[PDB]
């Protein structure tokens, strides 16, 4: 039987089959509800719109994210996301197809418990697995050793692996990713005059961030360049036809990833997080983590981030070590591609959490069987 | 059992059955009462005249409109209008047929209370319902989304509806329509030596407004053209035999719709009211609404109004928007046609306000049941 990989990220659900190269169904994880009064009777008036339909009719909908910082808050909304991504996107029956899910490290355990219980009682499977995203990213990079910075839409985590042995005391989680960048861009877009308050306008500011934003190599020189001349300014067309023009806010929005104190967080940026995750490891393997800095996630999809990361780690590391940022062009879907490796591996077939094991051991086998 | 549709506008009652294309009875809502000393005994003398008979003998009658700006003041006159349009015009029993009535938005509630009370106690029905006219106009246009500018004889209102979901905070109401234009034409027809002060003469000035008037594409150029040459001047024959000739007053009378400051009103024109009702909506849906300007009512029956409205909205909107105005040739009765859409729907059978629910909850259930 062919398997399913369903990366339930905070922003974008990426679901599809096993053995494929690209994910079949990429759609954002929002649940929309109508907030006005319907006057036309009938017309297929649904009480809820899930996914890209909620992207389409978004001017009359309140959009709720079921996932915040890797932790599923609303569980009926997550059931609606899973029902949509099984029955509408893929059009599959989960009773005859295995499923691998991805999970951030340092997650609360009851999230995994309710994920296992919904996947075994509501959408009950022959088998399923819950894995760590950084192991799948290092699978898709094609190497055995390396440190992975995975930054989705809620969770930025650094996990180092040497020779297939992960070090659990060096795992570093930071709750700063693209949704906080979207909220900070909504905060700083009001400086120029453009106001975005609703949940519908969050998608517009997210589209502005996806199309126009980039990581600056030097923040002070780019701020002096944007203050001096209007060469870095770019224009964008809104859905109502109005045209906006933004300047330094193209690079101030991803600069929260290297300076969290803009949004009031005490913790350091991603480069010192990666450097402290390197320095928490044992002393022999650090050189083998210095040359294999694998990036993944959509938030590392800016076209300035690899050279900035190389500059900051080269500033932090000793000078006699080679810093090599592994940045593949397909790093956005890469965790899914790692699942398409790991579902296809012949040695993984004994590592399924079967239904008989769940019915024997309760919902307690998921802690001792997984990581 | 077929339903009944009875649009009780400020100027013309349009009544008929459901399922029919044309309105069966279109007649003005006037009540005539005699104002002179009757000297011949007998001869079929009536104390009241309603409708076309009151139009026939209008030289010796005082005509009263029971509805002014959507608010019915004289209620015995309105009972005579309803008794005439049930027993004489339509000749049907109101005890065996449901009756839908229409209503302007932001109408006073006691009008709906007394309408429900007279429909349930004087002309007691199986059921009744109070609906919005712009929903029926958008039904008659055959679409789901769109902004509706309805303009009858008293009320001109803009209602935007997106995907069957109306926006109640964006509904705009203006008390300026064809009766005020008839009074303004009565004011400006005294410039050329023609005096019209009685209520009988208001029908003649309304016939002059219906027949000869048109909307100028540019007001200043057409005024300079009419001041320069006598090419736009037209002649009309009065029923006694006199001939009048008018020039610029063909396009000064419907210019008050686009410019209310002629008749001393602080409100802006209908194009800026339509633009503000678009701009009060959410930012995602405006590209539909600019493509779906829907006009209805007889006051939009001038043969110059759509090009002027397109020029004004095209000047107001940004240049990347397709300004489309849907003005069907049957837009004078289309609201009634929309009632014949809604009363013949199979899903509207559950939304009637019955006799038993009225006797349970008093005459106050029509607020919670309707819009």
């Amino acid at each position: 039987t062919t398997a399913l990989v369903c990366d339930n990220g905070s922003g974008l659900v990426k679901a599809g089959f096993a053995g494929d190269d690209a994910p079949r169904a990429v759609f954002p994880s929002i649940v929309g509800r109508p907030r006005h009064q319907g006057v036309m009777v009938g017309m297929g008036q649904k009480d809820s719109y899930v996914g890209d339909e909620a992207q389409s009719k978004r001017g009359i909908l309140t959009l709720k994210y079921p996932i915040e910082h890797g932790i599923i808050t609303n569980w009926d909304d997550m059931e609606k996301i899973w029902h949509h991504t099984f029955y509408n996107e893929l059009r599959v029956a989960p009773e005859e197809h295995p499923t691998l899910l991805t999970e951030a490290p340092l997650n609360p355990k009851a999230n995994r418990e309710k994920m296992t219980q919904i996947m075994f009682e509501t959408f009950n499977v022959p088998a399923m697995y819950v894995a760590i995203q950084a192991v799948l990213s290092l699978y898709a990079s094609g190497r055995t050793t390396g440190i992975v910075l995975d930054s989705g839409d809620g969770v930025t985590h650094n996990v180092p692996i040497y020779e297939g042995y992960a070090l659990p005391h060096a795992i570093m989680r930071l709750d700063l990713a693209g949704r906080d960048l979207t909220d900070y861009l909504m905060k700083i877009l009001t400086e120029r005059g453009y106001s975005f308050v609703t949940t519908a306008e969050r998608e517009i500011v997210r589209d502005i961030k996806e199309k126009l934003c980039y990581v600056a190599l030097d923040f002070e020189n780019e701020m002096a360049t944007a203050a001096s001349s209007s060469s870095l300014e770019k224009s964008y067309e809104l859905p109502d036809g109005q045209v906006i023009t933004i300047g330094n806010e193209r690079f101030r929005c991803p600069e929260t990833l290297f300076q969290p104190s803009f949004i009031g967080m005490e913790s350091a940026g991603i480069h010192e997080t990666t450097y402290n995750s390197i320095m928490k490891c044992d002393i022999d393997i650090r050189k083998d983590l210095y040359a294999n800095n694998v990036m993944s996630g959509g938030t590392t999809m800016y076209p300035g981030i690899a050279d900035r990361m190389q500059k900051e780690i080269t500033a932090l590391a000793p000078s006699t070590m080679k810093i090599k940022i592994i940045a593949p062009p397909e790093r956005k879907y890469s965790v899914w591609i790692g699942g398409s490796i790991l579902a296809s591996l012949s040695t993984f077939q004994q590592m399924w959490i079967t239904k008989q094991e769940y019915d024997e051991a309760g919902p307690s086998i998921v802690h001792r069987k997984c990581f | 059992t077929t339903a009944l549709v009875c649009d009780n506008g400020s100027g013309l009652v349009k009544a008929g059955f459901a399922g029919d294309d044309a309105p069966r009875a279109v007649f003005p809502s006037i009540v005539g009462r005699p104002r002179h000393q009757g000297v011949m005994v007998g001869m079929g003398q009536k104390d009241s005249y309603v409708g076309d008979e009151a139009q026939s003998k209008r030289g010796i009658l005082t005509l009263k409109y029971p509805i002014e700006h959507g608010i019915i003041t004289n209620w015995d006159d309105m009972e005579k209008i309803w008794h005439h349009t049930f027993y004489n015009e339509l000749r049907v029993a109101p005890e065996e047929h449901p009756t839908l009535l229409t209503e302007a938005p932001l109408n006073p509630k006691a009008n709906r209370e007394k309408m429900t009370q007279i429909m349930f106690e004087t002309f007691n029905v199986p059921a009744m319902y109070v609906a919005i006219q712009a929903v029926l106009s958008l039904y008659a246009s055959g679409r789901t989304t769109g902004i509706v500018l309805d303009s009858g004889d008293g009320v001109t209102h803009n209602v935007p509806i997106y995907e069957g979901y109306a926006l109640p905070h964006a509904i705009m109401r203006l008390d300026l329509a064809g009766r005020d234009l008839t009074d303004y034409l009565m004011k400006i027809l005294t410039e050329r030596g023609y005096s019209f002060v009685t209520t009988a003469e208001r029908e003649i000035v309304r016939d002059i407004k219906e027949k000869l008037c048109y909307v100028a594409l540019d007001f200043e150029n057409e005024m300079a053209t009419a001041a320069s040459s006598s090419s736009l001047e037209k002649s009309y024959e009065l029923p006694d035999g006199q001939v009048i000739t008018i020039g610029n007053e063909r396009f000064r009378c419907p210019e008050t719709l686009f410019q209310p400051s002629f008749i001393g009103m602080e409100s802006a024109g209908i194009h800026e009211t339509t633009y503000n009702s678009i701009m009060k909506c959410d930012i995602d849906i405006r590209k539909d609404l600019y493509a779906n300007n829907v006009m209805s009512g007889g006051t939009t029956m001038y043969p110059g109004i759509a090009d002027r409205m397109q020029k004004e909205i095209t000047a107001l909107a940004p240049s990347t928007m397709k300004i489309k105005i849907i003005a069907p040739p049957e837009r004078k009765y289309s609201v009634w046609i929309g009632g014949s859409i809604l009363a013949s729907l199979s899903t509207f059978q559950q939304m009637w306000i019955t006799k038993q629910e009225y006797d349970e909850a008093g005459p106050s259930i029509v607020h919670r049941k309707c819009f």
Partner: peptide, 19 residues
């Protein structure tokens, strides 16, 4: 006790929118 032993033993949418 017998019930305790038995219990605890160890399309329309498209037709609507068209019309």
């Amino acid at each position: 006790f017998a019930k305790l032993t038995l219990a605890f033993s160890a399309d329309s949418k498209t037709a609507q929118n068209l019309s």
